């Protein structure tokens, strides 16, 4: 929520915000507040099986959300609807490319460096954005 | 489990062990220890519907077993696997035939036996075992 670029700390303001590690078992867990048990009210000696029914259904709607519908758009999409980018005021992803950065090793050639190697990563790349129609004044931002 | 042929009783040792009657409603019931109700722990005023869930699933695995997976091989086969006869040290059924034994009646022909009949069951039969490759020293036993 940082109001101004001055509410930003040393590292961030200069280098950009941090992002998430590539998804794996520990870097992409289930939202921490994930329900691990759903309690349902019971009388003292009886249980409304018809209620227990709704109970589950209700839980469902809750999980569906927790798991993958935390954003409004996702909820709507869930019903089989749509949402303009103007609906939840979201940047419009115009283009997204990616690649693996490879390179080569430089060999050591002097008395002590001979047999040593330094890696010089160095990958070329294109990032093309198809003609795009800009409906309203704004900004086209490209980040890496 | 009888250790030696001498731990065997009169009848058995001479005639062979007893087997089960042809399957019918009373000769082929459900394993006597079959679950007739599955209890699940509940707090005092609430119930974990998510737990109640696993609870059922768990029961399932238990029943699947009780009903038809009491033998290791059957359990594995259940996953869609297999098991050498050497896995659970089981005899290898090489061939199994069967038939109905019919015969005829002999008629009584004397003053008092005339009109009486004795049944002489007497059925012929073949029991053929296709060429079989014996991988290790052993025994080929054929029982009736
Ligand atoms: C699909 C699998 C890849 O991650 C994605 C892009 O592939 P490409 O190779 O950059 O599409
Ligand atoms: C130019 C040609 C198109 O009519 C106009 C808008 O294009 P778009 O596609 O909606 O701009
Ligand atoms: C099937 C039904 C029969 O019991 C089994 C052997 O038949 P057959 O007749 O012996 O195969
Ligand atoms: C004989 C011919 C075969 O190669 C050998 C083993 O036969 P089986 O089928 O694995 O015995």
From Swiss-Prot, chains A, B:
It comes from the Viruses. Coiled coil: none annotated. Transmembrane segments: none annotated. It is found in: Virion. Assembles to form an icosahedral capsid with a T=1 symmetry, about 30 nm in diameter, and consisting of 60 capsid proteins F. Upon virus binding to host cell, one of the spikes dissociates from the capsid and the virus interacts with LPS through the exposed EF loops on the F proteins. After the genome had been ejected, the channel formed by the F proteins at the unique fivefold axis remains open. Pentamerizes and interacts with H protein, G and B pentamers to form 12S pre-assembly complex. By binding with protein D, induces joining of twelve 12S complex to form the procapsid. The procapsid has an external scaffold made of 240 copies of protein D, 60 copies of the internally located B protein, and contains 60 copies of each of the viral structural proteins F and G. Upon genome packaging, interacts with protein J. The mature virion is composed of 60 copies each of the F, G, and J proteins, and 12 copies of the H protein. Belongs to the microviridae F protein family. This is Capsid protein F. It comes from Escherichia phage alpha3 (Bacteriophage alpha-3). The chain holds residues 145 to 288 of 431 of the full protein.
């Amino acid at each position: 929520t940082e109001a101004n670029p001055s509410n930003l700390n040393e590292d961030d303001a200069r280098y950009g915000f941090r992002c998430c590690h590539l998804k794996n078992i520990w870097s992409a867990p289930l939202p921490p507040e994930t329900k691990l048990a759903e309690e349902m009210g019971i009388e003292s000696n009886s249980i409304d099986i018809m209620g227990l029914q709704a109970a589950y259904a209700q839980l469902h709607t809750e999980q569906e959300r927790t798991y993958f519908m935390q954003r409004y758009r996702d909820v709507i999409s869930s019903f089989g609807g749509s949402t303009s980018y103007d609906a939840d005021n979201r940047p419009l992803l115009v283009m997204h490319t990616d690649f693996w950065a490879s390179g080569y090793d430089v060999d050591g050639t002097d008395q002590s460096s001979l047999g040593q190697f330094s890696g010089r990563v160095q990958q070329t790349f294109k990032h093309s954005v198809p003609r795009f129609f800009v409906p309203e004044h704004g900004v086209m931002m490209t980040l890496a």
